[PDB]
């Protein structure tokens, strides 16, 4: 089988438990972690009517603050060190989707906090329900708080999606967001490449909800800030209506703000974001063409990881092939730049 | 209307006041430390806005997290400063807002 | 308050830049594609850039986020 | 106490060093005898030392009492 | 027919006065300056008895504090802007010696404060007595104090000549003094070249009294201090008893401290400080050989200034010939170099 | 036996003290201004020496000026600091030595 934390093949010793010793050491730091938290789901949830039909797919996701006491997790009302996000009732399997996607991003070299899948206590001997857990990056060693800030407040933007006008168009773009970050954080090629790869892989894996509130600035050393780790990375591909709304949460290029202009790929026969559009995003950030071409070729060889990680996941088999279909299609669209 | 204090890294650093016309967030007098946001530099000490400063508005929860309190005191079409008050300790980062 | 390190020798700067490169995880090939400076010229710059042109040194520094200041 | 000046361009350094040379009253011939850098190359360093080797720039800096620092 | 401040030829209008209009403006800043003081020597300069001796000729020099109200000079108890140094009783003519030597240093490109010669009021019908005057460098534009400190206290050395031992040997050198200065002041070649030129010309012009107290550090703001201007530069060559004591006040090279070693020029047939000795001092300060050779050739072409300045001076012809004899001899010894 | 005040640029900067054991010059704990000498850095605030610190020794007059003053003020030989008091106002530079 596969581990519920690392999605790695299990040995004969760890098979029965379902959790590998390596994974348990990654999450807690101890090999005596009990991933069966007890605490049945009905214990610590509250159900109630829908706010508005269509308020994102993550707007219905519950959140539970957790702390670790002697290898067993415990619920705290305020200021914990772990966060538990069960799967929404209307969208079952979302916890397994988040796990697989975030595990993929960790394998791809990104900064992803320690995460895993936990098991709820059974009530009437029903199949165990599994819930996603992740460690808060707002804590340092011994759980001491570190200050963070969301990008929407920092950029003085009223709406998470940039709809700050008298009409209904978006006036903030991924290009403009990159420019803001470049000014306040360190302008090194490592930050630029990582930010570029976040946007491309959000598109490749069908995340149309990377709003400004899914970006953060952590003030660790003090004055100089740094880009926050990857969080709330879920794939919207399994849900066609939510997926077909928008290609990406925000406009890619600054030219598309307010409906003023369109991306070069929109004018093409494909009528979609293509490779030439993402190439223009890289040149805006200062990335050289030869570097951008190699960065594209690296992503093509990384298809093996994407396929394997999702095929090893605990998602519904019907959800898996949906994500892989979006990936395969959009990945091929990265070749429509025809440059050397 | 409401008089609330802003504490960063535990010690109290600023003042949040809602008056008849609008909202004012002001730093203290001996505070030459770090700024709670890049949108609110510690250099400039006066921040008058007829709307809730975008930082404090973004600090509020949304969706299911907000839905718990919209069911309790109907925090729907309600003052965001009240929402922040209920979650002062539950604020992500090193920021806390507590009343005088 | 920003810490500052006074460069005493060309070797001092070259080695300190290699330390920044390795810390950030950047590769020699990656640096070549952006800067344009050949890999062979890059190896000499991270030992003693005494005979490497100032434009190449200044370029690599900015790619690594390192600022250069002067003061008596 | 500290008048640290961030060098933004290679040309910025060359021009800023030339100002110190004229301030202290030193001539190109005098610098040529000490540093060894030709008189023609010295004037090029005070225009744009982008194509002048880093050792020559650093040498002239030490001769003019200017220190070179790096930071982030 | 020459000026008493600038030692420049006088015009027909200014000949009788003895002072050129340009020179009076250099010192005071006005052309109305009265360089003929209105007080006799007996009024202020009390002639004290002979010291216990064993001191230098400058330990016998009196000093008078002066201030410039209107266009006439005036004596103050404390804190003036000018200092008047009359000629010692036992050493007459020293004021004219100081003037000529210091005028030469100004002409040679050094930083020398404004200086000149003034006349004491006569008592009966005697020959006018002349006294050297100099402006204090510890004063700003509005006579505002600028902080200065002498090197002996800064270097934490108790004796002016470096005799900080049980023997009369000297434990401080010109080489070590330069190293100290380099660390605390700015390390530019302009400072190094001028300091090197200061030491060579002290030897060339027979100033064997450049002790540590004849060096200063002026803190003209900007935090970092700078070397003080040239002051108390007199030639001791006219006085043989004082001259033959020592070539230079302090040992040139650090190897000579405490009598531990001797200079290469002392081992040579000349048995004196030669060109190689000052060359080794320059290499210690960081000066390149090609620069040192050109700096040596520059000093050689400057012989015209040295001869002319002293020949135009108001020194006794016997005193002039003494300084010029010391100069030419030592000047030729600078050519026993290696480069 | 005596204690004096060290003034720089018109402002009291330190205190020089004479006891049986030695001399102590201390900067003011609240004084973070310029140093009166490179031999007396403001970083270190304590300077104990069995002899008069060479800076204050160099501040004394010499030669004819000392001899003129010695026939008239003729105080205890090698009083050191006592000589400095009489020539406090006439001290070269921006330094003044004034009695406690």
Residue numbers in the entry:
A (entry chain F): 2 to 341
B (entry chain E), F (entry chain B): 2 to 101
C (entry chain D), D (entry chain A): 36 to 107
E (entry chain C): 2 to 340
Quote the authors verbatim.
Enteropathogenic *E. coli* (EPEC) O127:H6 encodes an additional, tripartite TA module, *hipBST*, for which the HipT toxin was shown to specifically target tryptophanyl-tRNA synthetase, TrpS. Surprisingly, the function as antitoxin has been taken over by the third protein, HipS, but the molecular details of how activity of HipT is controlled remain poorly understood. Here, we show that HipBST is markedly different from HipBA and that the unique HipS protein, which is homologous to the N-terminal subdomain of HipA, has evolved to function as antitoxin by breaking the kinase active site. We also show how auto-phosphorylation at two conserved sites in the kinase toxin serve to dually regulate binding of HipS and kinase activity.
To understand the individual roles of the two autophosphorylation positions, we next determined crystal structures of two HipBST complexes with HipT serine residues mutated to alanine individually: HipBST^S57A^ (2.4 Å, [Table tblS1]) and HipBST^S59A^ (3.4 Å). In both structures, however, the Gly-rich loop maintains its outward conformation, incompatible with ATP binding, suggesting that HipT is inactive. Intriguingly, the phosphoryl group of P-Ser57 overlaps structurally with that of phosphorylated Ser147 in HipA_So_, which corresponds to HipA_Ec_ Ser150 at the sequence level ([Fig figS4]**, bottom**). In summary, we conclude that the conformation of the HipT active site loop (Gly-rich loop) inside the HipBST complex is independent of the autophosphorylation state. Taken together, we conclude that HipT autophosphorylation at Ser57 prevents HipS inhibition and does not prevent phosphorylation of the target, TrpS. Another question raised by the structures is how HipS can be bound in the complex with Ser57 in its phosphorylated state if this serves to block HipS binding?
